[PDB]
Amino acid sequence: KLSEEQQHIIAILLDAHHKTYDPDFRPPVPLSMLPHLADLVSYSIQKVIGFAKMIPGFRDLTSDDQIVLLKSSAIEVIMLRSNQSFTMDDMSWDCGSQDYKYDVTDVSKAGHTLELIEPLIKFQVGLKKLNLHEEEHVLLMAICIVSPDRPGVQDAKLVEAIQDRLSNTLQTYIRCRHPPPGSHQLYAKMIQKLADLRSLNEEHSKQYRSLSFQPENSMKLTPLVLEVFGN
């Protein structure tokens, strides 16, 4: 049954998410969309950082550990948070108006291939099929970020203790608040989605390394994108 502490965490994560997710950039136009979507991702990294800072216990981590968690989770959290604006009606990210509505055609014009885009879209469909509560969605984003198995973490035990608190809150939430049979193996399906994001992260990194090796494309990126994803 959900403790005071557990309800507190959920309340904090929902508010952090509402404050940092809104359903200025170079305008949308094989690379025609790279400037706009580099800007969109660069901006979305700032939102991820805004959310991460409000995760209970995140602030207790060293600056270095905060940096390695954010560097390694940022693209995964961007893909994961986008799910709320994703519409199975026409497999698009429909951010209000048609200018800022993104289908397979649009997101494939930024020098990334269907090797990334097709799994990304299947991931969004698979996540919609789970029909998560916003409570489960914000817990999954927090567990995604505060992960003790990211390369470069110094205090794995502290990150593990924070993640376990978040994991325990999530499992408790599912048992008390998620309607069976929708609750059945829901925790395990959500962890599987975190695994699908690690694989999407790896494919993004491979493709980013090639794209960003081409200086004519690097030129279209942003300083934050270069610092987070690399040179």
Binding site: Q46, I49, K53, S63, Q66, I67, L70, K71, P223, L224, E227, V228
Partner: peptide, 10 residues
């Protein structure tokens, strides 16, 4: 080596 990330954290 991460000044902009560091700034956004603080």
């Amino acid at each position: 080596n991460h000044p902009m990330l560091m700034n956004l954290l603080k």
